[model samples]
Target: PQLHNGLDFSAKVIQGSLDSLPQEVRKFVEGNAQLCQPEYIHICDGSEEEYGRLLAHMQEEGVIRKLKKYDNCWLALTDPRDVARIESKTVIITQEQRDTVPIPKSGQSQLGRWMSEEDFEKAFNARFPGCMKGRTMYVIPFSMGPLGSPLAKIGIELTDSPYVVASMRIMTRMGTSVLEALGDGEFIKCLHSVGCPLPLKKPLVNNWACNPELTLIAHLPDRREIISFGSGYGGNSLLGKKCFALRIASRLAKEEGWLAEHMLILGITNPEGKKKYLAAAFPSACGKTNLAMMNPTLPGWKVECVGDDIAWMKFDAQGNLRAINPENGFFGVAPGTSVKTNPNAIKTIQKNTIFTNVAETSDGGVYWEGIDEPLAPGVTITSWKNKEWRPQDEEPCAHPNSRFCTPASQCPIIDPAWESPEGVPIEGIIFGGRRPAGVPLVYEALSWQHGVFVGAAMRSEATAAAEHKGKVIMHDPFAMRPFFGYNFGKYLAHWLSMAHRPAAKLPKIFHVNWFRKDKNGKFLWPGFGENSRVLEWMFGRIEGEDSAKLTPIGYVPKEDALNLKGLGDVNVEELFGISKEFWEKEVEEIDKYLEDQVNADLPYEIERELRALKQRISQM
Candidate 1:
């Protein structure tokens, strides 16, 4: 029933409106079955009422279950049987030539594995046959940044999964307004399907029956297109996230003289009402969300969020680094999130949210591992596996990868300028990771180039063997090991090149490690809300109202600079002090890492900085 591999119609659609797309992309998209069919349905950026209707239809189809506790929020349980396979199968596909494909040399090995483009298309064609015949192809036109912001990129995702469509509605600014704003403007064409080849049948499990083993997430950077097969999960199917924003948009930023980062944008207002903005990058498993929505425990300090996951920065006419929160919503992790960890995040998800693979409470609410307080004694619940959850059950009820999809506008602490097309002028940039030792609590870089050096040298050791082999040191520069989109060495070079631009008003860069530990494995820094103390110093240094003790590593806080007013007696000296012996060994590690991992053809200036850092540490 598939005609000419169903290539003709899809190919025609690709070249029609999205005419700038490369021929290879047109061929790939047209060849995939998900693209050929003119739709079982076409819902162009529908209204809230339309969303409600779709939700009701999805519920009738058993695609999702409504939660009684939260209005407009629902719970989706994936195929009850292959829960583990569903958990493990989401993937990313990239080019096979590691050296030839330009990723930063240092982080080349850390990015997910790559597959040949030819192989990817072949596999995609094989799995997409008859996949969309009975399914409704929901056309979702969305924007990544502010609706009219020049920094925003427009994309239309044609998906077969209603679940994906629902999530896209929350995570992106979707619908008719986006399409209207993008009138005649260029947009990335994204096509996806759950890769279910069979027709819908009774018992309903067959509707969700998908070959998880064959899921393929493939993107073409040069063409500015994304074609994903066989997964409905957020990271895989959310085309605006990994596809356009990080993967394709990153390449676009490089060419346009801007920067795209996996960072959070926050604004701190002083007691006098003067406000300054900051953008920070922290690797996964660290507290990027918490810090973005931080509630400063200290008096007279205020924090408001502009972005939680990705940030896009460009220089305004005023020669300042202005950043926009590229995403319209937050796709936050479910576990380890409670009122204490992130009150703002908790409040934002109470309405119009989607819960994936999380525990279903007796009253039809959602629950996860970090909610802390236990539920009532004997009420049966549906766990991630679709079985009864018992109070005595030893296993966690929710999947570790469970997520909450909610709009960013609902956040109580969302910045007033969150949607401003001009964006916030970034005053500071921070790079941090989890390290039990070696790295200091906080320090400032001497110069913008040195800041690049600091960002390039960031590393985190394994907390467990399952994460990697034997507690080996893992390097994640700029918190982008997983999403840098291109060559690692080239990324560093790109950052370095920014310092040379005349219009570049680069922000002051700082490094922080809240996970620093003492001898007994107790956290040296009282993290969570107490970390506001570090932020106070950061804001102080920016305002020139405070001075830091100069050290070989960078600028450290003075003996009394950090405000620890409410907390009990603690050792401030040890927290601010650098361990010479540990640093000497770390310098050796850096040298080894540079020689072994960094690209030999890296910019000469970066090499000189490394040598100078080593020389300075030796004199200490």
Candidate 2:
């Protein structure tokens, strides 16, 4: 039963050339097979034909619904309880204390809840072995970036979920080419199982298979490994996503002198015929996706999508920062996507897409909340919970966390050089989160150091309690509160050190809060496409225009600096206002946050920035 590599020989590789893999890879596969003991093994060869066959097999088996309206698209309704990521259950496994960031309050690590290696092995063996009893184990060789791109990283994800395999194909560069490219090279190793074994006595399949209560997402940053159990959700089973790209890659970035961030990269072109790129970070629930594919309302200006979710940035030979989207597809929220919010996303997901936890139509179409299109008359709607739905019902047709997985290549405004090995040069770096009030629409950081301070202090107030607890900000520094893989203090120091590169080589930094609301809860500034005007001014700052005047906090645009040519009868001059009282309280919040939340010996630069803000507020 055992092979020379101590693997069960019965789980023979199918479709792919197992011989092509390095000994490290084959042995790893063997070792996992010996534990899980799947009935068979299938190595994916990423091909259009293979993709078609996989879809056909899933449709025939009834785990997915084939949509008649959208070309080559399907809908999946998961178990209600397994809809979103469980951060509380996720763990970081490292034996040495040096690998984790120490925290004072709870005596826990800032990166994540750290687990000793010995404890992880015991739990891992208990859950993973025999978990895929009657399932065919799928070996997925995926690339985080474009194939052969210098910024790309390879991973071999072993899982028993066909759905996860199909999703990995859309989200990453995969197949034999990736395996060939990874010849004898190192790669992140990912192992996963939904923890629901099949019954041989009778054939049955559900829309989902997961042990929600037993879910555990473990990360071995030192070894570049991810072992997920009991859940088949976005960041949980999709190891190439938040797990490897952010958690594991962030640690790697720290060691390699670069940054792997939860930021989006967008290419901007002005009417004057200059193309520039910007990388922006925003906390979750903010409009990161819409901003990535934003349709500029301004005449003669253009914004192209380069990246939506995760950005990997490093310095080029010129010391100018460069960024690339580590993902090949967009796993974006399905609800609230309309012609009004994002027309480009609708166009991108029109075909060859997968919808999860969204409502289904009688005529084989998918529907979700906030979609503008009306359903055909007399057509029935099946909610995400597989029950009939009505507009008057309290529950929504689609789960709030519903997602559409579509390729980035199909985006209408995708940048031409999005996949280039030499990434797009960053002209501006932005940091912000969804704040309903107080923060301005936009402001320029005086220097790169100041910009890092803004980013380090980035946070989002939980909308429900925001107005009441104005000072109680839930800081998601760098918009990476849930994703960063190392010590928060070390992360701040790392960011500050990057600014040591010459000023000219560094990109201009700015902050924006488009979610600010006025009385009656109406949005203050016109957002969506209208936000392009904000970018024009941001870029103008980089070009050294006199449009911005120094404010106590930073640089705010002059009243007339923002062009409002077509915005009929609306003046948002208040967006440039800086309230001395509001800012005075904010400095104390920042000071308290750095002292308490980031209590792990923050960099001197952060302390200096806090002092500067306090001094400026006092003078005001």
Candidate 3:
């Protein structure tokens, strides 16, 4: 009934599943029922271990706002009769908790922009000052859509989260198809702020959303992680998925390390099948799941998806790449999926997925021929195309993927035993970014710091979801500015200082630009490139390379390979080459262009201390 992930819900929060579960699972679930499932509640997220502590805290305090229990992870139910939050998840802030952001009359008219431009700017400046000093914020003055296109509205503001607060925007589009309706003109303006439309690599495109606003996605020059919020409906989940791909990127300024072995490798490495393991790390969207399921270049060469989401990477004593999948299966979007982009990925999805967001048809719910389950109506917005049930273009922007979807377990490349405690070894690291001018294609990081620098460039936190209460939209500063913080800076410093291995054994960091100018002169990677392809290309770059090469997909590369044309062109390669040559001669460039703004920017004594700690770790 609810999105199925193996948990039960009732009038009061109950843990027991309908099916007979293992004793440990039953006890774990039953014990949770004792502590939670009050009349009305909201739960905290600490994972399963948090179950007892939450109940104890509730019991001791005798006042409860929410009931929390562990089903798959930690399910925080605001009301047991209707589960409010997803498991192990909580709404950071609800509509009631935030101020309304108004759309400036000068810009677009997206409904989510609750505050007037004046008030919105004030609130934005108040929360983060001097973030947009040199930059500009733009808004599309009109809704851009054709008769058959989706209604689209968008607004953009560029500020400094890490570097002059990259471009930020809010989008609301409604239509009959995820692609047709949402790919309107006004939306393009918003996407331009970060260069989401341009490809960062060649050949491979991140096709989660074919028409994306690239300018908005490539705003920040110094970013570590990307956080996105929105639902599967309205393709918000898909859009946000494309937008927030930097979450898994490393923050270290310099990287040196041996790729380590992990448990995921054992699960997917088939002795009989193709043994190639392509690594992927992205927050969500960016077409990772799609790419993971696509055909590999080497025939009989089966591509295994080590992880579609939540890939943790680290190095070992011997130089090698170690990686593993945190989640067992993928949570994929089905609205626009076709047999062409992903065949195997589609096959597994047809069998293993649970339906949500699909609407019913007169001939019974729209049935995907391969998927065993029947599609239901009302999971998402549906369009009536000649009496056939089609996914609605104007889906709600409140759920994950609101259209057709599937779980990762059903995919062919995935290892059956991937869920085990251990994971696979990581042998290579790839870093990507968007830039109009730079090396045309792919190349290797000159040094570990080069890799780290490229990895760090991102739109940290600039946009976010509006908090809603009972259908009322509350203004929320959910964008990138409010998301990335000093802690992120610290993490970057620590990761950089820690992950480096001994000389001659550093992991190869490849830089790729999926965007290339086709011989015909149109954008090459079309829907898949842009910022997402920067991530996808990272996955593809690892296929067979000890060293990186530059492809320069869409743009022309200057003779000076070290210099980039514009803001977002998989700059890691250029940065690698440039920083190596320039770091010595242009110390000021490091401070002015890069180092000064960092929270982890080390002082004289701190640098000494950090280096000393590294020495100590070496000694130990």
Judged by TM-score, which candidate is best? 2
Once model 3 is optimally superposed onto the true structure by TM-score, how far is the C-alpha of residue 16 displaced, in angstroms?
5.9
Residue 587 Cα positional deviation in candidate 3, in Å, after optimal superposition:
14
TM-score of each: 0.88, 0.94, 0.43
Count of residue pairs whose backbone atoms collide, per candidate:
10, 0, 124
lDDT string for model 3 (1-620, tens) is 54862334233322223133333323333333222222211221213343344434433432121211111111010111111112111111113212211212244322122223344334323322222123222111111111232211221211111110100111111112322223322222111111111222322121111112111112111322121221112212222222222111221212222121111232222224434344532222334555555554322234556555434345444544445443334445544455555666556644323333333334333323223343455543222122223335343212323233344555666664354333455545543323223223455554555455444432111111222234221111111211221123444454455444453344546544343344354443433313333333333334542223332111122244322234344324332232223223222333332233332343343344334323433443
Instruction: Write one digit per residue (lDDT tens) for candidate 1, span 1-620.
Output: 55566433533332123333335333433444344453454545557776887799789977788888887788887754333222123234555444323443455444444556687768866866677875566677788887877767888787877788778888888887876677666788898887674455323452464546677667666667687776666777888996678767776787888889989999998788888999999876577788989988988889999998888988877789989987888887788788887888889888989887888888777787778666676656788777778757897888766778888889999999999988899999999898887788999998988898888788876431112436556877777765756656777788988887787777899999998778898888768778888888899999886669889888888877888888756666667667788888887877666665555646677778888888888888
The best candidate by lDDT is 2
TM-score of 3: 0.43
Q: Stretches of candidate 3 above 4 Å error? A: 1-276, 297-300, 316-321, 358-381, 384-407, 433-439, 459-486, 499-505, 515-522, 526-620
TM-score of 2: 0.94
Inter-residue clash pairs, candidate 1: 45-175, 102-487, 103-486, 103-487, 103-488, 104-487, 104-488, 104-489, 105-488, 105-489
Estimate the lDDT of model 3: 0.31
Global CA lDDT of candidate 1, please?
0.74
Q: TM-score order of candidates, best first?
A: 2, 1, 3
Error of 1 at 280 (Å): 0.6
